[PDB]
Each structure stands twice: as C-alpha cells, then as structure tokens.
RNA sequence: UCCACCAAAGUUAUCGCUUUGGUCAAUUAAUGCAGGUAAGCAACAUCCAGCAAACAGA
DNA sequence: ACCCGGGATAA
DNA sequence: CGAGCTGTTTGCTGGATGTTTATCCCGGGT
C-alpha cells in the first residue's frame, strides 16, 4: 500500500507538562537562531568563493551534508574521533573553517553549547537542501528568459520601432505586425539558440551581450550537453548542475538593474518557527536523558512529558490504521502531531456527457466569484419574490485577519518601528557579497531587541517598550473590560448605576482597583505574571485602596503589567488557522442549509490573477475546499456572460457616480463610476412609468448569475453555448 | 406569591435575616429562576454568593455564584433569557429586580433598590420586594461604599424558601 | 487604512447606497465540526513568486 | 580491567 | 476583474518535497 500522512494540530499549554515547558521553549528558540545563522552563513561561505574564484566548484556543495557540517560549525561540543571523519567532512568542514572567524565577527555570533545536535541539524539541513531545490527548479527558468529578454533589448527595440512607424503614420496593425516581424521573431531566434547552448547568430546580440553570455556558459562543463537538447528540460532532470549558473544569472539580472530575487534561500522570519522533534531529540534534550533510548522505550518517553490517550495522539483514519510514530513539529506554542501508516524503519460544464448534464436538473447553484463578493450563489428556482440569493463576502473571512493586523499596527512599539525601517535599508535578496554582508551586520546591530519583542511569549523580556505609558480600564457598550485593548471580561451587572457626577471625584480613580482585581483574577492574565510581580501588583493595589487618588502607584502598576500589552504572534498565528477552518465549514454548512445537502456548484471560470491594488483571492483554494466537502463542481466560462441585460439581451452600461468606495482616497479621487450597479441600453427594459424613463437597473453579479442559468438551460436543451455568450 | 430568605453573615457572623416576596403571577419565569437559584434546586444557587457591589442609599447587589465579581453567573434556562415583562415598576424601596448589561441580558445576579429608581424603568425587570429584615437590608448597605466596594466579606450564606 | 451575519423599504432581482428590525464568544481564551454524556471525522513544516498594512527613501 | 558519555557514520 | 517605483516585519495565496533510527569507539574516570 502506499504512504499517507496527516497531521493534527493543537497547542503546548494542552498537551505538554509544565515541568517540561521550559527545556522545550529554550530549545525552539536555539535551533530557530542555528537555522537562521545556517542560512546565513552559508550563502556568506558561497558569495565568498564564487567571488574570490570563478572556478570554484559550487555545484558539489549544495547537498545535506554540507549543510550539516555548516548546521554544526555554530555549536560548539567536544572534540570528537576526528580520524573517523570522511574526505567529504574534512573538505566541508576546511571550507566552513575558512570564513567562520570571519562570519562570527561580522554578525557579532558565538557559538551555543549544545550537546546531541545531530538529529536536529539533520532535519534542519534536509529542509534547506529541499528548499533550494524546490527554487532552483521553480524560478531558472523563468529568470532565465527574463535574462533573455533583457539581453535581448526587447523593451527598447519594440519602443524604438513603435515610434518610428508612428512617426511614419503607419497603421496600428501594421505597425504590430512589422514588430513581430523585427521584433519578436528574432528574439524567438536568440531564445532558441540559447536553449540548445548555442550562441545566436551574428547581428543579433551586440559584443557585450556575447561576451555576457559567454560569461554565463563558461559555468557550465564546455563538453556539458542538457539532455534531450533543451536547458529548461535539463534544469527539472539534473538540477544539481545549474546551481552555479543560477547564481551567475542571478548577477546578470542586477547588471540590468533589474528587480532582485532571491537565488539563496534564507530564514528572516525573527517569531521562532517549526522545528521537528523526535524520540532522540526528546530523549536528549527536552527529558535530558542521558542514555541511548530504543524503539521499544520509544513511546514510554513521550508518555512522560505528554498524555497518548487524549484525542489527538490516538489512532485515526481508515480502519484507525494511521497510528502516531513519535515525531512532532512545533514552534513553542503550536503542536502538530504527525500520523502514518508505516513504520518508520528505514471539468467544464459545456464538455459534460448528456446524463451527467441532465442528472444536475434542479440543483445547479451558480456562483459569480468577485474581488470584495467571493461568492454570489443563486440557485435555479430563484425568482424575483423567491430570492434564494446568498452572499459570501470577503469581510466575512478577513474578520480575524484585519483585526489582528490592527492589532499588531497599533501595539507595534516604537523602538520596534524603528528597527525595522533601519534594517529595512539594506537588501536581502540581492547576491552582492558587501551588501549581503552589509546586512547581516544591520541584523546583528538589531536581532536582539527584534527576538526579544517577538519572543515575549518564552523569552526573557527586559526592554521598557511602553516608556512613561499609563492604562487606565475603560468599558465598552456591551459591558467588556478591556484595560486598554486587551480583552478582560464581560461585566454582566454593569448596567444598574445610581446618577451620574458623584460629588466625590476620588470614587472615579477608586474604580480603578475594582478593576484590577476583576482583571487579575482571569486564568490568561494570571499565567502571564510571575510570583514577584503579582505581589508587587497586590502591594500596589493595596496601596491606592490607602491612597486612591495618587497616580504613582497607577503608573508604578503600568509599568509592571507592561508585559501584557506584548502580542503573543504565535498564538495568533495558530488562531488565524482555526478561524480559517471555522469560516470553510460555515461557509459549506449555509450553502448546505440553503441550496439543500446536495446541492451542484457551478462556479465562474474567472481565475483571479493576484493583481495590484486587490487583495488575495481563495480561487484555487476555494475550489479545493469545496471539492472536499463532497460538491459536484463545474466551471463555466464567462465569457460576455455580465455585459448583457437578461430580460432582453441588450448591453449594459455604468452610469452611476459615487463616492470613492475606500474613504482614504476620497480626498484624492473623491467619485468614481459604479461598478456593481449597471443600467440598459433597451431604454425601456420594464413597464417605466415614463416619468423619467427609469431604465431597468441590474446588480452586475445578479445579471451575471442570470446569464449562467440562460446558458445552462441553452446546454440543457440543445447541448451547446448560446450564440450569444459564444 | 412564593417567599424566600437569605441568611447574611458579614466576616462569617451571622448578621441577620431578609425575607422577599415574588410576584410569581406577574412575572413567572424570573420568579421561578430566583426560587430554583435560592433553593439551589440545579446543583447551584445564591449560597455562599456575595454581595459583590453595595452602593450605600442606592443599592444592594449579588447573585454572582461563579466568580463573585459580576462577571458569572447563570440562569436555569441557560446563559441568559429575554426580558420577560416590565408590568411592576422601581415606585417605592426595597424593590427586588434583576441585574442585567442591557436588553435581553438577564442572568442570575439580582439587586434590591433602597431609594426609588424611577430612570430604571423599562431597563431592569423587577419581580419582587422585602417584607422582613429590612433593617437588615440597611445594616448590609451601611457596610458598603459609593464606588461599591464593601468594608466586609458579605455573603448569602444559606437560601431558602418559606 | 475603515467594513460580522439574517430580513423589510426607497426599488425596478438597485450599488463597499441610504433608512429601519433582529442576532453576538466579546477575546492578546482554545486542536476545529457534530453527538448531547460514549462511538466519527480534519495535512503540516520549510522555502520560494506574487499581492495588502505600517514605516523610509525615489 | 570496567564503565559513562558523545561525536560521527550510515540505511 | 476592477482600480490607481525601491527596502524590512507581518500575513494571505499559490507551488514543490518530506514527516529516524542503530552502531562504533575514543576520551576520561575509578
Ligand atoms: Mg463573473
Ligand atoms: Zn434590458
């Protein structure tokens, strides 16, 4: 049989002993800083050879085992067999020796004792090889022809002989058709001889762009030939020749000042992430064991730090055959159990058949998928009383994205803020060695307050984030406590209240400490203060009930609890992930309640490019989600399908003027077209009072939906697209 | 009209008795759910809740038996219930009504008025007014403070029903 | 730099339209659905290319 | 002699 | 489908590959 994996989430506080939580979280942030310096450095070693040498054998590096020697050269550990060591270590470990003085004193690093690295840096290291090779073999071939063109002067050939032919007076169409012959033709030409590696002919290229791609070709072994002739097919065959040259093309993007990309990949990501953790690693690390555990001991390990017998570490699947192999994935706050079933020893809807066309009669839902509408569903019973219209609105699953977003804008400190514009002054992706080197010396000027913020969770927390700051309680309408932003708890007998303006003020301030012992007594504000701060704060309280109207001891109590304005960015990155799941299954769940358990989905053929000044789009993933619930669904093309009015079949315009729909830009652009709204062209469309006319008015996703039920019915009964959406 | 009473003890000692009368013919859910919470019939009730919120010359409250702060408490037909009539009104002291965060949000919490609220009509739903103990009433309200805040742990330490 | 859902009307299957009625777990909480207490279901990390918010520079 | 790490290798 | 040119952090969307466990022996201590 073949090989599944699944993968349950859940949190640590759920699942994982407290006296264990510690050794765990120490670990998480250790391995993030060696992966990031295992990036790091080794793009610092490959951008000092190959610019040192032009002839140094790059190619051979890109493996596991380097990076593992690389992984290790950042911990530091006893001297172990050095005589048992292989040729390969030895040379990769010479290499690494080469630039480590170096690289530690630019990003100002030393190396961590950490005994038991190897599984961890196994791991890490198989990741990264995967990552590269996942790029390389994504991103060469286009950034290849993007060279091409380049070098091809593509851009200005075409402007050059547009302007001439327009200066000349020459027809649109001539002038295209003169630039293909000119233009285009011979750039297919030089493409072609590139592909086969073979120079393009005289008088295509100038002496530089030769002598460039020379350059790029003197990489590659001169008797090298890609197989099956074409260098695009090479690439995805034998990748691990190209590594060099894609490097090479890299630097021939920046001769051109073109935009960079990344051709090393790197970890920038300052919130600790996922790393693996296994029997070995929990054994060495987390336990501290001190002796060899084996597979039989291998689930009496994990029984002593967290419970097997809850929901998520029992069986699951078909026939519970996916049973837990003692490997997770966490972050130091999300967990994600891992299940196997072995061991680990080592279509459109007008090319549908006639019965499967006529089986849907009755249940076809049409959807229109939009930008700020990802989904107008209309069922084929709608009429203009029974409006079975439902509405899937991009607000409805951006709630919690934009929330948290805000959020984190407005609790971002200053200090914070200020980082990341500084660091933001030099590039990454860029391959130059100073630049890169440029910065890592930034990173490190700054790492350590970055780390700090994002780490509250685990981390020590030192810095005054919220200098001179003062927090005072305050209540919502629906009778929420929030001390400033962060949610308390709800006040249910908040409302009865004598009449307001006491005459005594200090009874405002007095208030205050009601508050707070409303608030310090809740399980999330509990955890997040430690034994000597909460005395400190009960003293504090104890304090202003003595003396209610001085602020020192608010702004003392301020100071203290500082720490809980500190985002937990993990958590919230866990929550943004259920939220998701929670809007698919509400999604699924009203489109069932609505349209009926077996509903058929008809859904546009729009692929929603990512364009700018539009937010992402859930198209392929919205599909794949609707797919797995069970739903019949087919696409549709939509082609004129919300260009013509469905009582007559004649155009539609955009009349109405409004305001700009984004309240930023009204004070730049204030009015703007309507887009949603059209009216038609038949002048009369409906039975108009002729007062003013009064032309039929269209919503465009309902006309759009309209013309979908037309063509359906027009397949329905002949079997082919109506003449008209043709 | 069913009765019923709480026994107050301030520091734990005993300072008197109250005893309500409910308007169980005007307004009968709210009547029942108090009688159930008094008697603890569902396993939970005012026993033990304390007076959370004593404002003196305006107003004692309580009823809040999950966290004794305001922020608990629940009714014995769930979370909360709709506001079942305002047919009695905040007319004279003593009156006994329900506590609530606004429209359709009443709970377990309660509170007795010692001055007319006539600006609380149509807001709280009041069902009941103390017949007896009185003066313990005032003795309780004397304890408290404006800001509500009271000089003494007071709680119902038994309920029950006459 | 803002917008949660369900209905009525301006209205004509009428807008990031307006005026009203109804709903609320608010959340920096937690593995998510449902079943009412049992018993079933659910892929995740990394990297990379894009697009949105904040900042700074052209 | 006898044992306790802990690096390093490899399927 | 719909709204008006560069760098970092976050996130949302899309594409590709994986998801450990025995064995040896040299340094060191008693
Ligand atoms: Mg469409
Ligand atoms: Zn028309």
Redesign the pocket.
Known sequence: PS?????????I??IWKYDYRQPLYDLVHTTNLLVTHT?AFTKYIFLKELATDENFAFNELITKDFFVEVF?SLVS??????????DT?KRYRSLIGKHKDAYFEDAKYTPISL?????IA??EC???Q??????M???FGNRLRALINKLFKKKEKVESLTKEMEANNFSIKEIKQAIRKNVYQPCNQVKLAITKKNMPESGLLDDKSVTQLNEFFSMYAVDYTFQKESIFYDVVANPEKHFKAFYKLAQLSEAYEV?????????????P????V???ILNYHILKN??????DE?FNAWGRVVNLE???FKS???K?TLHF???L?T?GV?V?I?K?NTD???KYIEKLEDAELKQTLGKCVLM??????LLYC?KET???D????????????????????????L??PSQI??A??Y???????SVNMEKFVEYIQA?ASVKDI?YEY?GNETAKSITEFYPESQFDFKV?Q?C?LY?????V??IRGFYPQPEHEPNDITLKSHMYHTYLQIMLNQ??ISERLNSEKRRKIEDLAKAILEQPHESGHKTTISSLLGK??????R???F????????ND?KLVK?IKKKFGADAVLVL?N?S?P?????????????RRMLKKNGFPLYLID?FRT?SFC?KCESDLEKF?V?P??????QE??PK?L????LRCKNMSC?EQQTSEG?????????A?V?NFRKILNCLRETKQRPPLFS | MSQVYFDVEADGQPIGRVVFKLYNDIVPKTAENFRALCTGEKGFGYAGSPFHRVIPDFMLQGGDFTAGNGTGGKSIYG?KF?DENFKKHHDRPGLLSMANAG??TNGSQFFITTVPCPWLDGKHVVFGEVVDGYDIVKKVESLGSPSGATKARIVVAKSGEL
């Not at chain 1, 935009?259 to 919130?271: D, G, H, Q, S, V």
Request: contains cysteine; aromatic residues 10%.
């Open positions: 090989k599944r994996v699944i993968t349950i989430k859940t949190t506080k759920g990036y290790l550990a006893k001297a172990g067999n050095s005589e048992r060591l292989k270590t005994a038991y690295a190897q599984q196994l791991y198989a990741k990264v995967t990552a590269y090779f996942n790029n073999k994504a991103h935009k960079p990309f990344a051709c090393f990949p790197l970890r920038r990501t300052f919130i992430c996922y790393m693996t296994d029997s070995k001190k002796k060899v555990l084996k597979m291998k809850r929901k998520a699951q699947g078909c519970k192999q003692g490997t994935e972050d999300g994600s891992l196997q680990t020893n080592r229109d998928p939009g930008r700020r509408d209309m709608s009429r203009a029974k409006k079975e219209i439902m509405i899937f609105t991009k607000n409805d699953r951006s709630k919690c994205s934009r929330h948290f977003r805000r959020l984190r804008k609790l971002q803020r200020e990341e514009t660091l933001s002054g030099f590039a990454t992706k990173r970055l994002y919502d629906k929420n001390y400033e932003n962060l949610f708890a709800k399980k999330h809980l304005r500190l985002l937990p960015f958590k919230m990155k929550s943004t992930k259920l939220f998701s799941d929670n299954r009203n546009g729009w929603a990512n364009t700018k000044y539009q937010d992402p789009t859930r198209n392929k993933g919205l939509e919300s469905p109405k409004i700009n729909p984004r309240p930023h830009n730049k652009q703007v309507c887009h949603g709204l409906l009064n032309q039929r008015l269209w919503n465009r996703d309902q759009a309209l | 979370g709709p429209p359709n």
